[PDB]
Structures are given as C-alpha cells and as structure tokens.
Amino acid sequence: RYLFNASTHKRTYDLVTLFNDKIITANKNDEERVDVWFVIVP
Amino acid sequence: MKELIYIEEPSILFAHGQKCTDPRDGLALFGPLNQIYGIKSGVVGTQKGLQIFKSYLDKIQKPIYNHNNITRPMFPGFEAVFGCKWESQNIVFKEITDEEIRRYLFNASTHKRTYDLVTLFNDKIITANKNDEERVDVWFVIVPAQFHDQLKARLLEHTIPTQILRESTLAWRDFKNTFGAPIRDFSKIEGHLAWTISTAAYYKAGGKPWKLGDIRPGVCYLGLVYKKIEKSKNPQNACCAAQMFLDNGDGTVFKGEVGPWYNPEKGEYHLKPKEAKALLTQALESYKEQNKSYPKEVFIHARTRFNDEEWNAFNEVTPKNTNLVGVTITKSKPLKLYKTEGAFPIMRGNAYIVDEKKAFLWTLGFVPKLQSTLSMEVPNPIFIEINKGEAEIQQVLKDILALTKLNYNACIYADGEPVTLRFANKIGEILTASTEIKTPPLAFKYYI
RNA sequence: UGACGGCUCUAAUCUAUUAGU
DNA sequence: ACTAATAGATTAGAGCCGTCA
Numbered sequence: 001r002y003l004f005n006a007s008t009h010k011r012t013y014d015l016v017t018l019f020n021d022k023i024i025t026a027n028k029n030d031e032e033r034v035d036v037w038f039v040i041v042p
Numbered sequence: 043m044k045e046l047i048y049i050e051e052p053s054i055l056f057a058h059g060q061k062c063t064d065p066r067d068g069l070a071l072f073g074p075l076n077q078i079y080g081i082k083s084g085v086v087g088t089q090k091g092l093q094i095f096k097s098y099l100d101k102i103q104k105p106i107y108n109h110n111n112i113t114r115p116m117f118p119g120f121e122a123v124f125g126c127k128w129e130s131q132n133i134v135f136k137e138i139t140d141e142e143i144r145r146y147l148f149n150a151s152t153h154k155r156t157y158d159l160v161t162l163f164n165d166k167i168i169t170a171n172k173n174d175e176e177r178v179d180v181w182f183v184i185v186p187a188q189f190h191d192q193l194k195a196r197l198l199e200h201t202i203p204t205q206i207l208r209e210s211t212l213a214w215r216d217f218k219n220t221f222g223a224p225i226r227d228f229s230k231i232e233g234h235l236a237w238t239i240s241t242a243a244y245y246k247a248g249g250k251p252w253k254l255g256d257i258r259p260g261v262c263y264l265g266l267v268y269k270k271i272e273k274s275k276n277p278q279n280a281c282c283a284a285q286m287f288l289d290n291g292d293g294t295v296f297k298g299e300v301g302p303w304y305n306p307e308k309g310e311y312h313l314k315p316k317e318a319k320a321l322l323t324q325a326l327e328s329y330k331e332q333n334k335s336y337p338k339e340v341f342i343h344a345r346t347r348f349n350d351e352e353w354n355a356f357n358e359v360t361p362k363n364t365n366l367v368g369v370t371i372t373k374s375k376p377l378k379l380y381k382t383e384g385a386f387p388i389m390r391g392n393a394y395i396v397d398e399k400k401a402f403l404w405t406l407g408f409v410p411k412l413q414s415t416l417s418m419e420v421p422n423p424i425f426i427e428i429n430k431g432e433a434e435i436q437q438v439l440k441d442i443l444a445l446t447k448l449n450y451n452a453c454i455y456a457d458g459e460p461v462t463l464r465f466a467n468k469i470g471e472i473l474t475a476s477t478e479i480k481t482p483p484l485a486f487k488y489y490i
Numbered sequence: 491u492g493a494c495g496g497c498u499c500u501a502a503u504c505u506a507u508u509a510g511u
Numbered sequence: 512a513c514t515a516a517t518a519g520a521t522t523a524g525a526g527c528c529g530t531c532a
C-alpha cells in the first residue's frame with residue numbers, strides 16, 4: 001500500500017528484492033533461453 | 043502355463059500437434075516442436091581441434107547414410123531436419139598453452155594435475171564470458187579418469203551451458219592403433235552419431251524437441267537414489283532427489299528438487315527421519331505455485347526397500363486426499379525366457395502378473411518395425427514391486443512404460459529403466475565433486 | 491566424455507543363531 | 512554388553528567389448 005516517503009529504505013528494498021528474486025528464479029528455473037530482460041515500471 | 047498380458051506402446055507428439063511413435067521419424071518428417079532462429083558457438087582447445095571441428099561441422103550439413111538404413115534411418119541434413127542455422131564462420135576460440143611441460147599427466151599426482159587443469163579451463167572460460175563483448179551460447183571442449191567430473195562442478199555457480207567431445211570421436215579416420223586399424227570404428231553408426239550430437243546441441247541451446255501428450259492431470263512423479271562418498275567419517279549422505287513432472291494448465295516441466303540431504307550413518311541406506319520431511323515440503327510448493335492447486339495424487343519411485351517410520355512421517359507430512367506409493371525397480375533377476383521356435387526373441391511390452399503387487403515387465407524386446415532386437419543377447423526382464431501404498435496396479439504397470447522414451451541425451455527408441463532414476467544418478471556424481479556449492483540451479487541444461 | 495546394452499571381478503551393511511575370551 | 516566365523520538375502524563400484532553375422 002502507501003507508507004509515505006518515510007521508510008524509503010524499506011520502500012526501495014522490498015521492490016528491489018522482489019524484482020531480483022523474480023529475475024534470479026527465472027534465470028535458474030526455466031528451460032527457455034533468454035538474452036535480454038526489459039523491465040517495465042509504472 | 044500362464045498368459046502374459048500385453049500393453050500397447052504409448053505415443054509421443056511432434057510439430058503441428060500431431061502424433062507419432064519414433065522420435066527419429068518425427069525429426070526426419072516434421073522436425074522439432076519449438077524453433078530457435080540460430081545458435082552461436084564457441085570453442086576452446088588446440089588449433090588442431092579447431093580445424094577438426096570445422097571440418098566435421100561442414101561435413102554435417104550434407105546428408106549421410108547408414109550400413110542398413112532400416113535399422114537406423116538416414117541423416118538428411120542438419121538444416122533439413124531443423125532449419126536452425128549453425129555455421130562454421132561464427133566461432134570464437136581461446137588458445138591454450140601448448141608447450142605442456144607437465145606432459146606426465148597420466149602418470150603423476152592425480153589431485154594436483156586435475157585441480158590445475160580444471161582451474162585453467164574454468165578460469166579461461168570465466169574470463170571469456172566476463173570480458174569479451176561477443177555473445178556465446180554453448181562451449182565445446184576438445185582434449186587429446188576423474189577428469190570430466192570436476193569441469194562442471196565449479197562452473198555450476200556461473201550458470202553456463204557446457205559440452206565435452208572426445209578428440210577421437212570426430213576424427214576417428216586417422217585414430218589408428220599399433221596394428222593400424224581404428225580403435226573405435228564408426229563406419230556403421232555415423233548417421234546415428236549425427237542424430238545424437240545434433241539433438242544434444244539443439245536441446246542445450248534452448249530448444250525442446252518433443253513433449254508427451256498422453257498424460258493425465260493431477261499427478262506428480264519423483265525419484266531417489268544413493269551414492270557412496272567417503273571424506274572424513276564416511277557420511278553416506280546422497281539423497282539426491284530428481285524429477286517433478288508437474289502439469290500446469292498446459293505444458294511439461296522438468297525442474298525437480300535438488301540438494302544432498304545427509305544420512306550420517308554407515309550402512310543405513312534408508313532415509314533419515316529429519317531429512318524426510320524437508321524433501322516433500324520442498325517438492326509440494328513448486329507444483330503448487332505454478333498450478334495454483336495442490337497435487338491430488340502423487341508418486342514415489344526408488345531402488346531400495348525403505349523402513350516404516352519414514353513412511354509414517356511422510357503420511358503425517360502428506361496433505362489430505364493424497365496417496366503415497368513407493369515403486370521399487372530391480373534389474374538383476376534371472377527370468378530368462380525363450381521363444382519356442384526360430385532364432386528370434388520375445389516382443390517388448392509383455393507384462394507378467396504373479397500376485398496383487400509384484401510384477402515382471404519387459405522393455406528390451408524387438409520393435410515390430412526395427413526388424414531386430416535392441417538387446418545383443420536374449421534380454422532379461424525387470425522386476426516391479428509396490429512396497430507400501432494402495433492404488434490400482436494395472437495403471438501403474440502401463441504408466442511406467444510411458445516414461446521409457448524421454449531420454450534427451452540420445453535418440454534411441456527406448457531405454458530400459460525410466461529416465462527419472464537416470465536423471466537422479468546423473469545429478470549424483472556431478473553434484474558431489476565440490477562440497478562448497480550452495481543453492482544449486484534447477485535446470486537440466488548445465489550438467490547433462 | 492556418444493550412447494546403449496551385455497558381461498567380468500571386488501567390496502559392504504541388516505537380520506537370527508552358534509562357538510568365545 | 513563387544514569382540515571372531517558360516518550361511519540367506521540386498522546392494523554399489525569399476526572395467527571390457529561390441530554396435531546387431
């Protein structure tokens with residue numbers, strides 16, 4: 001949800017952990033070979 | 043004086059969503075399922091390896107024949123079967139030291155020489171991957187024994203596909219002996235060699251040749267195996283699980299659960315009580331999150347009878363409405379049969395039921411269309427037993443045969459044992475080379 | 491390590507008992 | 512309460528050799 005500009009450390013850490021774990025799991029789990037990853041952020 | 047029940051052979055799928063039996067027929071007729079626009083290679087070794095590999099690669103593009111094409115279909119051409127571009131004008135090459143002062147490798151200190159050579163190769167590959175701008179997909183290694191084991195173990199951390207080919211495999215023409223004859227004559231199975239290398243290269247580049255389409259939903263397959271290791275106190279750890287075979291709304295999956303759970307005892311090949319829970323706990327959620335639902339029915343394969351307390355612990359661990367069955371497969375059981383007439387053996391797919399649980403099954407019987415038998419001599423059966431669990435015997439007997447053709451490392455018509463145990467065994471010896479590996483990857487590409 | 495199969499020798503724990511200091 | 516010697520019956524490594532007359 002919205003936690004204001006405060007807790008900005010947690011604010012960036014949560015999102016970056018989510019994206020990083022998603023990318024790492026995709027790289028180490030899926031079978032199809034990929035070359036580039038285009039990240040779309042709102 | 044008992045009738046033997048015959049089970050019809052299952053079928054596989056190919057391009058355009060159509061069915062067939064032999065993978066080679068589908069390849070020569072419809073090719074692969076998914077398509078990759080091409081592959082970019084990369085080679086390491088000596089310049090002799092470079093010229094030999096280039097010569098062989100340009101030899102592949104033209105069709106080749108077999109001694110008796112009915113026994114083995116002909117190879118029509120790499121681009122014909124696949125249409126995937128693979129040329130000999132896009133190869134990168136990193137030179138190796140060639141003076142080779144340590145020419146005494148085969149008769150010297152094994153550990154030091156192996157560590158030095160594997161360090162050299164791995165460091166060169168890492169430097170090439172982390173420095174050069176040009177992209178790479180696979181790597182072929184040519185070398186002129188506890189040797190190939192360490193090569194993949196250290197590189198497993200960096201998630202890079204790899205392949206190794208013997209120096210005598212490609213240029214077998216001049217590989218003569220003291221008599222002068224080739225030591226590994228390949229004058230009859232060159233087409234099948236091309237088949238095997240081409241399919242291995244296509245898979246390891248990210249292409250999926252074929253998938254099953256005669257499977258039922260709500261089922262999961264699993265297997266376990268044990269291997270011997272002695273470092274300090276002989277901890278018979280093993281317990282290297284494999285296979286998941288889950289089914290989402292559409293598709294096949296071969297991730298599996300990996301990690302060497304430890305059995306500290308000496309001869310207790312039976313699983314530890316503490317480690318048992320973690321295996322099923324790590325197996326369940328992988329299917330759950332992909333398919334959004336729990337697996338109603340599950341399967342367990344093995345190769346050794348296990349005690350009761352592990353089964354109990356699994357029973358409390360397993361969720362509601364899930365049946366647990368442990369299927370034991372044995373290969374060394376003398377049940378030599380004989381066809382009454384002719385110089386010719388029995389078919390494949392014949393099953394013999396002795397009781398409610400135990401059974402004898404054949405896989406190495408002649409194909410009706412191959413005009414010959416896979417086994418060199420009269421084949422021997424395999425024994426199937428159900429230790430614990432309640433289910434229908436007939437569907438289990440027919441279902442194992444469906445998993446006798448998913449061998450991606452080769453293009454044989456079928457393999458005796460189901461490839462689940464083969465995958466687990468293959469993971470075993472390659473994951474135990476180095477004990478410093480943490481969180482191993484969950485893909486079959488890197489170590490096959 | 492091309493991959494499969496058929497073989498050939500070597501080793502080892504778990505039962506249940508005996509002889510044994 | 513553990514140390515040797517005979518069996519039945521499981522259970523795992525390695526090493527050769529052919530490739531379907």
Ligand SMILES: [Mg+2]
Nearest residue numbers: 242451490492
């Ligand atoms: Mg291989």
